[model samples]
Target: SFSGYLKLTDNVYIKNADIVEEAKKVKPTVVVNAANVYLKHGGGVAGALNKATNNAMQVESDDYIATNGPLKVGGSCVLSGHNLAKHCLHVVGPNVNKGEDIQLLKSAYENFNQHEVLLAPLLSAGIFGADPIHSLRVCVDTVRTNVYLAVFDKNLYDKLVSSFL
Candidate 1:
């Protein structure tokens, strides 16, 4: 299914409030914040794709509620439409604590029996309410490239870290 929208603002709404409104629950399996990566000043998540669109995943305190290999993030758009570009991909990683997004992913790599998946969340390494180009970067450069990329930002920092590491 293909969905598109033209907006009065150059922004698309991925409101969690409404999403939870329907389900009657607000549980974010994981969250990543790219601001921590310390990319070039003003380099972070300029676009949906730049925000670790291609490869990354998010992890949080409550992700361990269950066990499933085909884990799925709680969103309709994989990386908020980045999946369409067909580079980075996302899937449910694991459940964890505040900074556990990395740990959950590590566990998923160690135990989960399935193809590897990337992860990231806004809190861990994503900054919203800004421009796609100006506000972009990865959360942690200390990521493991073994299983998959835990996307943070698709901006210069991500590219640089991705190249250097």
Candidate 2:
């Protein structure tokens, strides 16, 4: 029996690990960074991640927005990753008080999907106010298998794993 991981379809696994601390080094990659419309890496998971990369991630996001404008819901873009990860795939998860909420959330995950491996988290679980279960459901369904998710919250891990694939 596995302890910290749950195997889903295609051997895709949801793992219990620290997204921030574990990612502080250059060992992670293609993180499905939870972001807002502005692609501001300055709060919640974004803040924590930007801090670890010495604000370089914020710099990249700034450059991207400066050139391309705001990233819309379900849209994602890749930028050279900083200290911790190999590359960064930034995506905006849909928010509350919006239409087609679940549909957009699904798009974020699927749109974020690329290559062979990704380090995913419960995107839009907070700040953006998307329900964790809803975020979890859509991510598992759309994200490609063989992906490894890094989670920060233990309570969330225990609660979500039971209800997740």
Q: Highest TM-score, which number?
A: 2
lDDT (Cα) of model 2: 0.73
Local accuracy of candidate 2 as per-residue lDDT tens digits, 1-165: 223566656746766677775556326657667877787887778888788888998988898899999988888888876776788778788767445375688878876556577766777776667778777777777876456666677888777778765
Query: Mind giving the per-residue lDDT tens digits that candidate 1 earns over 66-164?
Result: 333233322111232222222222323322223334433333222212212222332223332322222112212223331212233346334534443
- Whole-model lDDT, candidate 1? 0.26
The residue-level lDDT of candidate 1 at 14 comes to 20
**Candidates in order: C-alpha RMSD to true structure:** 14.7, 2.9
Segments of candidate 2 deviating more than 4 angstroms? 1-4, 97-100
Give the Cα lDDT of each candidate: 0.26, 0.73
> Clashes in each model (backbone N, CA, C under 3 Å)?
35, 0
